Design an enzyme around this catalytic site. Structure first.
Site, PDB file in Angstrom:
ATOM      1  N   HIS A 286       9.312  -5.183  10.254  1.00  0.00           N
ATOM      2  CA  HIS A 286       8.399  -4.818   9.179  1.00  0.00           C
ATOM      3  C   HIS A 286       7.647  -6.053   8.690  1.00  0.00           C
ATOM      4  CE1 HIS A 286       7.798  -1.549   5.926  1.00  0.00           C
ATOM      5  NE2 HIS A 286       6.774  -2.382   5.897  1.00  0.00           N
ATOM      6  N   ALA A 287       7.017  -6.765   9.624  1.00  0.00           N
ATOM      7  CA  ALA A 287       6.315  -8.008   9.316  1.00  0.00           C
ATOM      8  C   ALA A 287       4.833  -7.952   9.698  1.00  0.00           C
ATOM      9  CB  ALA A 287       6.994  -9.181  10.019  1.00  0.00           C
TER      10      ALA A 287
ATOM     11  N   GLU B 226      15.776   0.849   7.889  1.00  0.00           N
ATOM     12  CA  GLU B 226      15.522  -0.583   7.853  1.00  0.00           C
ATOM     13  C   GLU B 226      16.502  -1.236   6.882  1.00  0.00           C
ATOM     14  OE1 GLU B 226      11.387  -1.216   6.962  1.00  0.00           O
ATOM     15  OE2 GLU B 226      10.733   0.173   8.532  1.00  0.00           O
TER      16      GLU B 226
ATOM     17  N   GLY C 121      -0.127   7.452   6.160  1.00  0.00           N
ATOM     18  CA  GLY C 121       0.918   7.324   5.164  1.00  0.00           C
ATOM     19  C   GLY C 121       2.020   8.331   5.424  1.00  0.00           C
ATOM     20  N   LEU C 122       3.220   8.043   4.930  1.00  0.00           N
ATOM     21  CA  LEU C 122       4.321   8.994   5.016  1.00  0.00           C
ATOM     22  C   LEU C 122       4.269   9.921   3.807  1.00  0.00           C
ATOM     23  CD1 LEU C 122       6.780  10.077   6.423  1.00  0.00           C
ATOM     24  CD2 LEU C 122       8.183   8.393   5.210  1.00  0.00           C
ATOM     25  N   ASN C 123       4.112  11.214   4.062  1.00  0.00           N
ATOM     26  CA  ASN C 123       3.999  12.198   2.995  1.00  0.00           C
ATOM     27  C   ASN C 123       4.852  13.431   3.281  1.00  0.00           C
ATOM     28  OD1 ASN C 123       2.307  14.091   4.664  1.00  0.00           O
ATOM     29  ND2 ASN C 123       0.873  12.368   4.546  1.00  0.00           N
TER      30      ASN C 123
ATOM     31  N   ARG D 132       5.017   3.889   9.131  1.00  0.00           N
ATOM     32  CA  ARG D 132       6.298   4.171   8.490  1.00  0.00           C
ATOM     33  C   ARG D 132       7.279   4.741   9.509  1.00  0.00           C
ATOM     34  NH1 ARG D 132       5.274   1.119   5.319  1.00  0.00           N
ATOM     35  NH2 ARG D 132       5.169   1.270   3.036  1.00  0.00           N
TER      36      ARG D 132
ATOM     37  N   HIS E 266       4.328  16.212   4.521  1.00  0.00           N
ATOM     38  CA  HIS E 266       4.014  17.082   5.655  1.00  0.00           C
ATOM     39  C   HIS E 266       4.021  16.414   7.029  1.00  0.00           C
ATOM     40  CE1 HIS E 266       2.049  19.328   2.233  1.00  0.00           C
ATOM     41  NE2 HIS E 266       2.802  20.266   2.778  1.00  0.00           N
TER      42      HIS E 266
ATOM     43  N   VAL F 137      -6.419   0.577   7.803  1.00  0.00           N
ATOM     44  CA  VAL F 137      -5.846  -0.086   8.971  1.00  0.00           C
ATOM     45  C   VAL F 137      -6.341   0.577  10.252  1.00  0.00           C
ATOM     46  CG1 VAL F 137      -3.728  -0.707  10.204  1.00  0.00           C
ATOM     47  CG2 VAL F 137      -3.791  -0.800   7.697  1.00  0.00           C
TER      48      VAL F 137
ATOM     49  N   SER G  32       0.808  -1.217   0.000  1.00  0.00           N
ATOM     50  CA  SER G  32       0.000   0.000   0.000  1.00  0.00           C
ATOM     51  C   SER G  32       0.844   1.271   0.000  1.00  0.00           C
ATOM     52  CB  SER G  32      -0.930   0.011   1.212  1.00  0.00           C
ATOM     53  OG  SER G  32      -0.189  -0.104   2.413  1.00  0.00           O
TER      54      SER G  32
END
Ligand SMILES: NC(=O)c1ccc[n+]([C@@H]2O[C@H](COP(=O)([O-])OP(=O)(O)OC[C@H]3O[C@@H](n4cnc5c(N)ncnc54)[C@H](O)[C@@H]3O)[C@@H](O)[C@H]2O)c1
Ligand SMILES: NC(=O)c1ccc[n+]([C@@H]2O[C@H](COP(=O)([O-])OP(=O)(O)OC[C@H]3O[C@@H](n4cnc5c(N)ncnc54)[C@H](O)[C@@H]3O)[C@@H](O)[C@H]2O)c1
Ligand SMILES: O=C(O)C(=O)Cc1ccccc1
Ligand SMILES: O=C(O)C(=O)Cc1ccccc1
Ligand SMILES: [Ca+2]
Ligand SMILES: [Ca+2]
Lengths: 328, 328
Positions: free
Chosen positions: A290-291, A270, A213-215, A241, A217, A160, A75
């Site tokens: 990250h699982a 990572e 999400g990582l964006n 993230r 801002h 999520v 995603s």
């Protein structure tokens, strides 16, 4: 023509092949970076499949001479400069239902591991600890807290986040969320409480869990400043993230006890190691590699969706035929 | 008169004192057994408070010359021969709401740790494991399974079992239960599926979780015979009583992979050690030191209830004034 489709940061294409066998030449690069990719792939690849382990800057993207589409098997697409990709005529897509409930279940596991100290208690037994008396039980499980009436703050109420909220209520959590991009009303639909600022969220939450999400801002959304806005002895969970958290500020918080515990499945750098970085000597820490996303069914599902997206691109027109293009 | 009340297997009576200060002389023995208790206490104690760490056989009970009531600070009383106690004129009580939701939350944590392999993944990182590729993630998280559509079998649908069932549904579990002592209909009230035999439960369950009391008829309920009735690669969770499981049969099952994983908060011999017993070299194992019950609020609550029961006994008539006598 049988255009070339390349799996960049992987070595296995078995799931994808049955879906692409007749319309694409499929190859893999098992590359952690573009330096590792062959000129042939850079020159001829019309489509690309990738996970989260490789990053594509505009410079990386410019190396691709025939690339028309990238599909993230997953995603999150913060690892791709999608804007530059689009400017270069490269559609970028994702798989949004990728492991929604797996990730939510992992998130709950982490939350419960913090409140119940289950993972740490197991670790202690592995180390040789003997817990004979009730007094010893209380001491070793010190920090374990009753869940009902506690306030869980969700940052990012997407797929999520929503799955997490519903599960959380079943435990007696009071669920709040902060998500500035959502329209009016979702809070009523799902029976949640919404707050308008991040500070409000942090101020009223015993346990904070990230699902945004990582964006552009929200890099280091959790920082020296905002950590101070968090309740004393608060928990932090992150399956979103790693870039969302300044691990320096988190380390200091854990040491000072300002934050009672943290559970991280993602990290600034990572793969993660307990021996390398700010969190090296930080206490009350749970970490997974990250699982959160992983189950056999989930892994197969997202790969099948990604291949179908590749197929739609080759057999049809871009970007009209695409299901999940995120850079129109 | 200020009759003597003794905390047998503990050293702290601070919570109890404010409730008994005016009607009882309160002392503690910090004893793991009756050998450790002073003759004065054995001779003069009219009431006794105890946890799970000391056991009272008829022989032990016969040593008490003035004892009229025992109150278990907790729900389980398998560690007391309550029948002989009653024959000796000794009322035995418990605290049934003791940590119901704490234990249910711990149970869910364990279940989630098995399905998501979170505790093991953390353990691996602590050991130095580096997980760089998606291929590595799948390998190290191998065994992690999607929860929705899975069948959770509950053995004993009492207070904890019911709390667990409700939580389980929120994750997409299909919940079954086996409880031969319950009356018709609870399954309809709570929206569950009931089966009439233990074999049926084990046969249809991907994950089995124990929530029954330990009694005369279910020692080693899980044994060589019944383990064979469990599905291949099934999970087992136990936060009830260690005596319910033959750890020899469980060890062999884990080694053979017949059982994919087990999570135990209780054991045949407590305190538990990873270095002592059948489970010593058994794989895919999670263990906690009988701490499923613990939270500060829970610990205080049950102690306050237990003291009130002691007070009701001294200030009133036995057993009519008692709230939770389990051996009338
Ligand atoms: N660790 C894993 O294995 C794993 C698995 C799946 C997803 N993820 C990550 O979890 C995150 C959530 O995934 P999803 O499927 O729910 O995505 P989604 O797009 O469904 O949800 C994202 C939500 O976050 C909100 N958001 C964005 N920026 C925000 C900010 N600054 N403050 C508050 N809210 C903000 C958005 O409004 C949106 O509702 C993603 O970043 C993804 O990368 C991780
Ligand atoms: N590990 C911990 O810290 C902790 C904390 C609380 C309770 N416990 C244990 O968990 C167990 C459950 O506690 P509870 O409060 O739910 O008790 P409860 O009396 O409310 O529930 C017990 C249920 O188990 C059923 N049962 C008894 N024998 C059975 C059998 N052979 N097969 C199927 N069902 C059977 C009974 O019908 C009853 O409904 C107790 O044994 C207790 O000792 C452990
Ligand atoms: O991290 C994400 O954004 C995901 O969707 C999960 C994932 C992780 C690794 C490979 C595929 C999907
Ligand atoms: O184990 C039980 O039966 C309980 O009720 C939990 C508990 C455990 C230790 C002390 C008090 C209560
Ligand atoms: Ca708190
Ligand atoms: Ca299975």
């Amino acid at each position: 023509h049988m255009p070339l489709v390349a799996l960049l940061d992987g070595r296995d294409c078995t799931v994808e092949m049955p879906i692409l066998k007749d319309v694409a030449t499929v190859a893999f690069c098992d590359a952690q970076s573009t330096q590792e990719i062959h000129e042939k792939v850079l020159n001829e690849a019309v489509g690309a499949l990738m996970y989260h382990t490789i990053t594509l800057t505009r410079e990386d993207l410019e190396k691709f001479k025939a690339l028309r589409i990238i599909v993230r098997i997953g995603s999150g697409f913060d690892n791709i400069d999608i804007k530059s990709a689009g400017d270069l005529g490269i559609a970028v897509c994702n798989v949004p239902a990728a492991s929604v409930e797996e990730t939510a279940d992992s998130t709950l596991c982490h939350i419960l591991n913090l409140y119940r100290r289950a993972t740490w208690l197991h670790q202690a037994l592995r180390e040789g600890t003997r817990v004979q008396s009730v007094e010893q039980i209380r001491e070793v499980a010190s920090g374990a807290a009753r869940i009902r009436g506690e306030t869980l703050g969700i940052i990012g109420l997407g797929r999520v986040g929503q799955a997490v909220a519903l599960r959380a209520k079943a435990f007696g959590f009071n669920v709040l969320f902060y998500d500035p991009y959502l329209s009016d009303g979702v809070e009523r639909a799902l029976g949640l409480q919404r707050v308008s600022t991040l500070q409000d969220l942090l101020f009223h939450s015993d346990c904070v869990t990230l699902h945004c999400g990582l964006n552009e801002h929200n890099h280091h959304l959790i920082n020296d400043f905002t950590v101070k806005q968090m309740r004393q002895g608060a928990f932090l969970v992150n399956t979103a993230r790693g870039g969302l958290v300044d691990e320096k500020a988190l380390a200091q918080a854990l040491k000072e006890g300002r934050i009672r515990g943290a559970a991280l499945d993602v990290h600034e750098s990572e793969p993660f190691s307990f021996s390398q970085g700010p969190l090296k000597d930080a206490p009350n820490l749970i970490c997974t590699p990250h699982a959160a996303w992983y189950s056999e069914q989930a892994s197969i599902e997202m790969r099948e969706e990604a291949a179908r997206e590749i197929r739609r691109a080759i057999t049809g027109r871009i970007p009209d035929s695409l299901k999940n293009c995120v850079n129109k």
